Symmetry: D2
Subunit: 140 residues, 4 copies
C-alpha cells in the first residue's frame, strides 16, 4: 500500500488518494536505520518546464524519513511528523526515476534525523534532503 | 496561463493541468518582483495517509512560487531560474481548508535570489515557513 | 554581562571567557518576541581572508535566539538550547559592526523559531539565520 | 600556515593567530579534494555561559573546513570560494575534550560545492552535523 509500514488498522486517507499515491511513491526497503523508496517520473511529478518538481524530491524525503520513524515508534505509543526538511538540488531530473535512500544519523528521544539521497537512473546524486522528525506521545 | 503562472514564453514543455502544480491545484494570486502569493485548496491529493497536508505540499508550493516569481523578472533578461535550496520548517499541521503562501524577496543577487515563504491556514495561523534560494543562470536554451 | 538575560545566580562560564565575550557580542534589546544584539568587527571576528567569519554570524544568531528564549522560559523551569541553525550569506562584511535582529515567528511547547537578520553599518542585509530552539524541562 | 590551512597564497590579510580560527584554536589535520578533517580543544573560549560548546563553534569549524577544503582546489584555478549557506543541526552537547570535524564532499558543481560535515566528541559520538554549500566564483582580486 505504497508498501508503507503497516502499523494501524485504519488510516484517514487511502494510499491511492494521498499525494504519495497520486505521484506514485513506493517504499522498497525499511529497517530502523535505513530505508529506500522510488518513483517513476511522469508529468504528475514534473513542473511546467519539464523537470521533476522541487516539491517531489522534498515530498519523497519527507514520507520516507517520517514513515521509517513511524515504523519503529508507533508501537511504542508515539507519533512522528516531519519538523524540518532541508533539500538542496544539485542536478535536474527530466525523466526515468528518482530513487531515495534514507540513512538514520541520530535517534533521540524527541527528534530523529535522517539524511536522504535522491538519485537518477544513472545513479547520480541529484538532490539531498536533511529530514528532522519530531517524535511525541500519541494524542488520545 | 494555467494556475496563473507568469506568461514569459510562447510554449511550455508541460501543460499546467498535467504538472504536479496542476494536479494538486496550486494557484498564484499576486505577483510582483518583490512579493508573490498563491494558494491551494486542501483535498486528499494534498494530504498524506494520516490525514494532514503532506510536508511535500508545503515545499512544493514554496518552490513553485519563489522560482516562478524569479522567472517572472529574469526570463526576459535571458536568464533561467531554478530552485537550488529549500528549507521548510513545520510548526502546525493543516487538516483542511486552504494553504496560503506569501513569498517575500529578501535578497536578489546576480547568481542567487532568496525568498522567505510563509504558509498560513484559513485562520491566518503560521503553519510552515520555507526559505527558498533560487539560482539564476544564463539560459542555455 | 554582555547584557545577557540575568536569570540565575551562577553561570558555569563568565562572559569575558565565553566565545561570546571573546568576540564581543552585546545584547541591546530583549522582549519575548524580539531581540537585538551587535558586535564590533575586529580580527577576532574575521577569517584569514579579512572578511567576518561565517561562524561569527551563526554564533551571533544562536546566542541571541537562544538567550531570548531563556529569558522567558527559564523562570518556568525549562531549559532552552539551539537545535538547528540555518544561516545563508548574501554579502560579506569586512569591517565596522554586525547588527542582529531576532524576530520570534513561532513559540511552541517544545520548539521556538526565530528569524535573525544580520546587517552591516550601512544597514544592508548581509546574512540571515533561521534558529530553531528546543525547549525542555530543566534537569535537576 | 597557522592551523595548517591550505597554503595557496604568498600572503594573507589576517594572520592565523589573530583570526577567529586562531583564537579558538582550530587545526586542520587531513586535507584532500574529497575529504578534510580538523579538530579543536574545548576551552572556555569555545563555550557559552551555560558551560557547553557554543553552537557557533560547530558552525565556524564546519565553515572554515568546507570553505578551505574548496579553496585548496580552486584557488590555483583562478577562483575564490566563500560559504553561501551553513545548516547545522545539534544532536548532543559537548562539555569538554575536543570537537572533531570530518567534511566529505558530496557535490562539486561549477558554481557550488557541497560538503557534509560531521562533528564528533572524544567518545566518537555524533554531536552535530553541518551541511555547507560553498559558492565558487572567479577571483576579482
Ligand atoms: C536539542 C536536544 C535538547 C533535543 O534532544 P533529542 O534530539 O530528543 O536528544 P535526547 O533528548 O535523546 O538527548 C540527547 C542529549 O541531549 C541532552 N539533553 C536532552 N534533553 C535534555 C534536557 N532536558 N536537559 C539537559 N540535557 C538534555 C543530553 O545531553 C542528552 O543526552 P543523554 O544524557 O540524555 O544521553 C538535544 O539534541 C541537544 O541537547 N542537542 C544539543 C544542543 C546544543 O548543544 N546546542 C548548542 C548549545 S546551546 C545554543 C548556543 O549556542 C548558545 C550560545 C550562547 C548562549 O549564551 C546561549 C546559547
Ligand atoms: C556567495 C556570493 C558570492 C554569491 O553572490 P550573489 O548572491 O549572487 O550576490 P552577488 O554575486 O550579486 O554579489 C553580492 C556581493 O558578494 C560579493 N561577491 C560576489 N561575487 C564576488 C567575487 N567574485 N569576488 C569577490 N566578491 C564577490 C561582493 O561583495 C558582492 O557585492 P558587490 O561588490 O558585487 O556589490 C555572495 O552572496 C557572498 O559573497 N556572500 C557572502 C559570503 C561570506 O561572506 N561568507 C562568510 C565568509 S567565507 C566562509 C568562512 O567563514 C571561512 C572561514 C575561515 C576560512 O579560513 C575560510 C572561510
Ligand atoms: C513538530 C511539532 C509536533 C512540534 O511541536 P511544537 O513546535 O512544540 O508545537 P506544539 O507542540 O506547541 O503544538 C503545535 C501543534 O502541533 C500539533 N501537535 C503537537 N504535538 C502533538 C502531539 N503530541 N500529537 C498531535 N499533535 C501534536 C498540534 O496541532 C499542536 O497544536 P495544539 O492543538 O497543541 O494547539 C508541531 O510543530 C507540528 O505538529 N508541526 C507540524 C508537522 C507537520 O505537519 N508536518 C508535515 C506532516 S508529517 C510529514 C509528512 O510529510 C509525511 C508524508 C507522508 C507520510 O506517509 C507520513 C508523513
Ligand atoms: C542550481 C544549479 C543550476 C547550480 O549549478 P551547480 O551546482 O554549479 O552545478 P553545475 O552548474 O555544475 O551543473 C549541474 C547541472 O545543472 C544544470 N545546469 C547548470 N547550469 C545550467 C544552465 N545554465 N541551464 C540549464 N541547466 C543548467 C545542468 O543539468 C548541469 O549539468 P551539465 O549538463 O552541466 O552536466 C544546478 O545545481 C541545478 O540545476 N540544480 C537542480 C535545480 C532543480 O532541478 N531544482 C528543481 C526544479 S526548479 C524549481 C521548481 O521546483 C519549480 C516548480 C514549479 C515551477 O513552475 C517552477 C519551478
Amino acid at each position: 500500500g505504497g508498501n508503507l509500514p503497516d502499523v494501524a488498522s485504519h488510516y484517514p486517507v487511502a494510499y491511492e488518494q494521498t499525494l504519495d499515491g497520486t505521484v506514485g511513491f513506493v517504499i522498497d526497503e525499511m529497517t530502523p536505520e535505513r530505508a529506500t523508496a522510488s518513483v517513476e517520473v511522469t508529468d504528475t511529478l514534473r513542473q511546467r518546464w519539464g523537470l521533476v518538481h522541487g516539491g517531489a524530491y522534498c515530498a519523497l524525503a519527507d514520507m520516507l524519513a517520517t514513515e521509517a520513524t513511524v515504523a519503529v515508534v508507533h508501537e511504542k505509543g508515539m507519533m512522528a511528523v516531519g519538523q524540518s526538511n532541508h533539500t538542496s538540488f544539485f542536478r535536474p531530473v527530466k525523466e526515468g526515476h528518482v530513487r531515495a535512500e534514507a540513512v538514520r544519523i541520530h535517534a533521540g528521544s524527541t527528534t530523529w534525523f535522517w539524511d536522504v539521497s535522491l538519485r537518477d537512473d544513472a545513479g547520480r546524486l541529484c538532490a539531498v534532503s536533511s529530514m528532522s522528525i519530531a517524535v511525541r506521545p500519541r494524542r488520545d
